Design a protein around this ligand. Structure first.
Ligand code: NA
Length: 152
């Protein structure tokens, strides 16, 4: 329902750091490697993974791909922050499609200011695991927001 999305745009920004509240060895670096075969995994409600973009940027969406994303739905919020201390929730009570392993986009408007973007997990529809294979913040005004990342 965002009709101004485009199929091409500028390169996605590269985070300067990716961190997490915890993980099982499958660390948050595996969010940012453009590889569906690697994941961040952390069990429990409220565990998080955070991307630091190094400076304040504007974003109106995330794209995320989910472990076993064709078998179960992941539950999550997205928060952002200018300073890394005060957080704003931009997406709440999100649910992945449960219908694909590739990138899915979760978009809002308008774009907001953020240096730091974080995925706050609430497990999945089968169990408490937060297991994500890819995460990136995006700005649909300047980056591609492909129709193929709307799953249904
Ligand atoms: Na990965």
């Amino acid at each position: 329902d965002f009709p101004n999305n485009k199929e091409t745009g500028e390169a996605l920004l590269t985070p300067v750091d990716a961190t997490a509240s915890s993980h099982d060895g499958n660390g948050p670096d595996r969010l940012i490697d453009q590889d569906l075969t690697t994941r961040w995994s952390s069990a429990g409600d409220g565990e998080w993974a955070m991307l630091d973009y190094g400076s304040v940027q504007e974003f109106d969406a995330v794209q995320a791909s989910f472990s076993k994303g064709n078998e179960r739905q992941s539950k999550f919020d997205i928060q952002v922050s200018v300073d890394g201390e005060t957080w704003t929730t931009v997406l709440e009570n999100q649910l992945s499609s449960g219908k694909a392993i590739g990138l899915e986009r979760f978009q809002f408007e308008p774009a907001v200011k953020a240096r730091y973007v974080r995925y706050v997990g609430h497990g999945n529809t089968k169990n408490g695991w937060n297991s994500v294979t890819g995460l990136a913040a995006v700005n649909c005004s300047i980056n591609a927001c492909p129709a193929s990342q709307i799953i249904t």
